[PDB]
């Protein structure tokens, strides 16, 4: 899913760039995951990115 950010509680906008979990495919903004830039997001994606529940369950 994309058209809701459960981290922000759904005040969705297209202006902030996004990243997704490799397992769940759910999208979230860079800022609600403390990622600074599009390049930091590309680095985080190349590292094999994870959503909020995937931190305890399957991190990296």
């Amino acid at each position: 899913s994309l058209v809701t950010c459960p981290i922000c509680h759904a005040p969705y906008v297209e202006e902030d760039l996004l990243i997704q979990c490799r397992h769940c495919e759910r999208w979230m903004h860079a800022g609600c995951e403390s990622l600074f830039t599009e390049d930091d997001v590309e680095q985080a994606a190349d590292e094999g990115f994870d959503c909020v529940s995937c931190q305890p369950y399957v991190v990296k």
Partner: peptide
Amino acid sequence: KGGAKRHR
């Protein structure tokens, strides 16, 4: 999707 996304 492609891990990263930006509109536009």
